[PDB]
């Protein structure tokens, strides 16, 4: 991959780095394998991120996945719209789904 890291002069230059991409997820175990940078490991499944790193980490991961889906087709949406959706999905301490088993099980009035 190509990542832009600040140069010793002070400018941003793209230097290549070797990245391992995987089929399957074992985040807890892989994060401990020596040689990797455990402060940068990322997982496609934000559920594993929430289980290992916490709700706030899952909140950031959930936004990243949603942002990627929107931008994969080239469309752009403002940050606040996606941020609000992810905040609602994480406001109760866990990942609440947008199905009838998630947000529809709150305490918001039967008529709603």
Partner 1 sequence: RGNLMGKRVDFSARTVISGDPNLELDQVGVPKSIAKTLTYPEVVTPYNIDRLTQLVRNGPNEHPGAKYVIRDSGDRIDLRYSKRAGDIQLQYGWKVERHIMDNDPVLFNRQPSLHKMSMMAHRVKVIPYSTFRLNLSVTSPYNADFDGDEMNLHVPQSEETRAELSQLCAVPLQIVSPQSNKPCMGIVQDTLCGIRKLTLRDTFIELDQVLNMLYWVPDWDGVIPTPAIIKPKPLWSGKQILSVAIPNGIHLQRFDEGTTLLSPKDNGMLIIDGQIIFGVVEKKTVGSSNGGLIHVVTREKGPQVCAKLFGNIQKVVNFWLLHNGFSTGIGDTIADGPTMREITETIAEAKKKVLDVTKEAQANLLTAKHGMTLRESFEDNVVRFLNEARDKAGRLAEVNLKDLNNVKQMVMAGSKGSFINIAQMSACVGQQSVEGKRIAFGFVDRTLPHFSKDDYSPESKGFVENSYLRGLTPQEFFFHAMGGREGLIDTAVKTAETGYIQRRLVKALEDIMVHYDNTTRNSLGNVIQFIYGEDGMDAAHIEKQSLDTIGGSDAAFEK
Partner 2 sequence: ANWPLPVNIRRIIQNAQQTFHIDHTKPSDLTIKDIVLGVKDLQENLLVLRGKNEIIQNAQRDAVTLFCCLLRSRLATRRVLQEYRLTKQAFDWVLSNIEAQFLRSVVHPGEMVGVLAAQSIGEPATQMKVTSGVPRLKEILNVAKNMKTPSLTVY
| Interface residue list for partner 2 (CB under 8 A) | 17, 19-27, 30, 36-37, 40-48, 62, 65-66, 69-70, 72-73, 75, 77-82, 84-85, 88, 95-99, 102
Q: Quote the least distance from Cβ 77 to partner 1, whole Å.
A: 6
Q: Which does 108 bind (CB under 5 to 8 A by kind): partner 1, partner 2, none?
A: partner 1
Q: Backbone dihedral region of 109: left (phi > 0), alpha (psi from -120 to 50 degrees) or beta?
A: left
Please name the residues in contact with 89: beta carbons below 8 A apart, sequence gap of 6 or more: 62, 95, 96, 97, 98
Chain position carrying tokens 């305490």: 107
95 close to 58: Cβ distance less than 8 angstroms? yes
Based on the shown chain and the rule CB under 8 A, indicate whether residue 88 belongs to the binding site for partner 1: yes
Q: Which is nearer to partner 1, 28 or 91 (CB)?
A: 91
Residue 68 lies near partner 1 (rule: CB under 8 A): no
| Sequence-separated contacts (24+) of 29-37 with Cβ below 8 Å | none
Q: What are the residues binding partner 1 (CB under 8 A)?
A: 7, 9-12, 75-81, 83-85, 87-88, 91, 98-99, 102-103, 106-109, 112
């Amino acid at each position: 991959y190509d990542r832009k890291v600040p140069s010793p002069t002070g400018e941003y230059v793209k230097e290549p780095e070797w990245v391992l991409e995987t089929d399957g997820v074992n985040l807890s175990e892989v994060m401990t394998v020596p040689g990797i940078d455990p402060t940068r490991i990322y997982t496609n499944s934000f559920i594993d991120i929430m289980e290992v790193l916490g709700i706030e980490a899952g909140r950031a991961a959930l936004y990243k996945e949603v942002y990627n889906v929107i931008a994969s087709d080239g469309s752009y949406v403002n940050y606040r719209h996606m941020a609000l959706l992810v905040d609602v999905m994480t406001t109760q301490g866990g990942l609440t789904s947008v199905t009838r088993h998630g947000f529809n099980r709150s305490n918001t009035g039967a008529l709603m």
